[PDB]
Write an enzyme that holds these catalytic residues in place. Structure first.
Site: not given
Length: 323
Positions: A34, A216
């Site tokens: 992430d 992201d």
């Protein structure tokens, strides 16, 4: 310094996750790599939540190298959250062995965000300023100990295929064409940078005058402020349905416009095929509005089209046309 090729499993073009090994002997876990966070944590045996019940739980008692830190940890991801305790243990990411690494062992995972997810835990790739107290990001440990050849990593997400790849320590040239274009990170917390405009048919429909965006890997869609996203949905022909998402005529792609994001003077177009998700012969917009968005989130929708490079040496984001 070495380079790790971590294959990423693709679940419905919405969740990309890899495999790591924690403790001695190794305990296998699927983690979401992430770039929107910086904490590393997995479920533990002490967590009795449903998300922990239907996932792999780490047993520190069975790890000869585990060392409890006695420090709390709490993170917020999406609509859900996690609480737990920090500890020390060895984590194996591909062929890189990261000993004495801080890892969160979850004790509670309320809600359903992690209950139905395919990954067990989260390995954050953002900056240390976003990490929790008494924790060190995995990639920051790898950089400080010079476990990687270059303080850089790279993400390629394959559309519909099983060829996605996270490269730690280098840039794999197999996954892009053309030249990499470098964008300065504006705030060293997320992988944040400036977007100059969003354009459809030559007219600015969103990000008028500038906006901030983070790259992201932990977000499936392309998220932005509600009004801008609604402008985009109107312009591309998407229609609000009573199920929460925005419909798209599946056969209408050949007539739909291209949405161009301007980043550091360069144009990054997204074709209808690129920004439309196809699931069970239903077509939905890859653009998602959120009442909380103070900036844009370029998620897997964007990364699948642009091979992404995260450079901690010079604090840059490289983008190139993905294969």
């Amino acid at each position: 310094g070495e380079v790790a090729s971590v294959p990423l499993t693709n679940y419905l073009d919405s969740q990309y996750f890899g495999k790591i090994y924690l403790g001695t002997p190794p305990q296998e876990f699927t983690v979401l790599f992430d770039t929107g966070s910086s904490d590393f944590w997995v479920p533990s045996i002490y967590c009795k939540s449903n998300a922990c019940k239907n996932h792999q739980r780490f047993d520190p008692r069975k790890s000869s190298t585990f060392q409890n830190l006695g420090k709390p940890l709490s993170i917020r991801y999406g609509t859900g959250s996690m609480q737990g305790i920090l500890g020390y243990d060895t984590v194996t990411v591909s062929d890189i062995v990261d000993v004495q690494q801080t890892v969160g062992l979850s004790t509670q995972e309320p809600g359903d965000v992690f209950t139905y997810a395919e990954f067990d835990g989260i390995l954050g790739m953002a900056y240390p300023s976003l990490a929790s107290e008494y924790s060190v990001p995995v990639f920051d440990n790898m950089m400080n100990r010079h476990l990687v050849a270059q303080d850089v990593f790279s993400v390629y997400m394959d559309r519909n295929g099983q060829e996605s790849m996270l490269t730690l320590g280098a840039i794999d040239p197999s996954y892009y064409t053309g030249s990499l274009h470098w964008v300065p990170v504006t705030v060293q917390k997320y992988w944040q940078f400036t977007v100059d405009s969003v354009t459809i048919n030559g007219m600015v429909v969103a990000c008028d005058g500038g906006c901030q965006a983070i790259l992201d890997t932990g977000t499936s869609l392309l998220v932005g402020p509600s009004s801008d996203i609604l402008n985009i949905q109107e312009a591309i022909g998407a229609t609000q349905n009573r199920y929460g998402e925005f419909d798209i005529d599946c056969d209408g792609l050949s007539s739909m416009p291209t949405v161009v994001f301007e980043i550091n003077g360069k144009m990054y177009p997204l074709t209808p095929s690129a920004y439309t998700n196809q699931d069970e012969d239903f077509c939905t917009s890859g653009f998602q509005a959120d009442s909380r968005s103070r900036h844009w989130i370029l998620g897997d929708v964007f990364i699948r089209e642009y091979y992404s490079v995260f450079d901690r040496v010079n604090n840059l984001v490289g983008l190139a046309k993905a294969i």
